[PDB]
Design a binder for this molecule. Structure first.
Ligand code: NI
Length: 341
């Protein structure tokens, strides 16, 4: 049955609640982004109204074959009316098409659901600045002070310089990047751009990327692997065995692989700076784990909530254990006492 933290009080609305069958009293189903833990349950047989971004609507239509008449895409940063309630969709700084949703309840309560997000000071200048929020449904993925990670910009600088160096030293090296969902496209696109190559990938992945409105994408991606020296493979194939096999398939065009695994966090963060990151190497294969996150660090999360000053916080992640929930509630009290709301 549907958890309480997916239900918006005083409305007929749910958020990211497609795996519970017909939810009692739900008149409109919102989808924050196209990740499987959130969309699980949608298909061509869904016949309730789904409200989402344009990009998410493209992916529903083309990848899951949801019928167009049930997809209701909304423009960002625009006041819209849904079943009698004003809503706004804001950029979540997550994966392409990912949104936060502001709901303006008829009784005067204002609710922000972040979906999945990476908090940023840029958010302090959207339509959030203009009114008070009473309740915050918060992505608490990394809600503990051990979770520090560098900016996206520093991580991409490290990747570009590493790949450019390796291929300049050996023009017969192949670069491989792992993927399992949309998100983190900057990793493989920035590398291809510095090498003057397109990114080669499966037809299924190319189709997924064509749904995303990324400008000049026909310019950076391709299904012709033979013309490309940056290849995208499933994340599960980013290991020594999987990569030895791929290299066999390239028919002696290449004699070395440098591969990247963009992870969220890994405990090498508590000790090591990005500058200090080293690969695992075996033979002519090296694998770098890089801490490219599309969720808030602890400090970014803290800053956002201390700026927003909500009256109540409802966590949406790590809610399944009493020790996690207690930990989070303790941090929320600290933040409130330190900031004075
Ligand atoms: Ni997500």
């Amino acid at each position: 049955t549907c958890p309480f933290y997916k239900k918006i009080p005083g409305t007929g609305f749910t958020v990211d609640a497609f795996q519970y069958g017909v939810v009692e009293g739900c008149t409109a189903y919102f989808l924050t982004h196209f990740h499987s833990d959130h969309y699980a349950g949608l298909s061509k047989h869904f016949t309730f109204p789904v409200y989402c971004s344009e990009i998410t609507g493209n992916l529903l239509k083309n990848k899951l074959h949801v019928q167009e008449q049930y997809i209701h895409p909304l423009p960002l940063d625009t006041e819209c009316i849904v079943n009698g309630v004003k809503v706004v969709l804001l950029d979540a700084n997550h994966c392409p098409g990912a949104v936060m949703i502001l709901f303006y309840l008829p009784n005067g309560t204002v609710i922000l659901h972040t979906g999945d997000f990476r908090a940023d000071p840029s958010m302090e200048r959207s339509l959030l600045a203009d009114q008070k929020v009473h309740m915050l449904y918060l992505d608490t993925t990394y809600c503990s002070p051990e979770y520090t990670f560098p900016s996206q910009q520093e991580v991409i600088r490290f990747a570009i310089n590493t790949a450019f160096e390796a291929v300049t030293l050996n023009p017969h090296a192949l670069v491989v990047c792992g993927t399992y969902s949309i998100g983190k496209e900057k990793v493989f696109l920035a590398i291809a751009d510095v090498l003057g190559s397109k990114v080669g990938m499966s037809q299924e992945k190319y189709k997924t990327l064509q749904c995303l409105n990324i400008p000049e994408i026909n310019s950076l991606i391709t299904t012709d692997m033979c013309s490309s020296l940056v290849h995208l493979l499933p994340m599960m194939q980013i290991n020594f065995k999987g990569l030895q096999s791929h290299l066999k398939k390239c028919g002696g065009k290449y004699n070395q692989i440098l591969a990247f695994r963009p992870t969220g966090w890994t405990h090498s963060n508590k000790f090591t700076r990005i500058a200090d990151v080293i690969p695992q190497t075996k033979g002519n294969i090296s694998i770098y784990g890089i801490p490219y996150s599309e969720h808030s660090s602890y400090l970014e999360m803290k800053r956002f909530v201390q700026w927003l000053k909500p009256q109540k916080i409802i966590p949406t992640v790590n809610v399944g254990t009493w020790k996690s929930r207690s930990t989070m509630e303790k941090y929320f009290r600290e933040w409130k006492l330190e900031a004075g709301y």
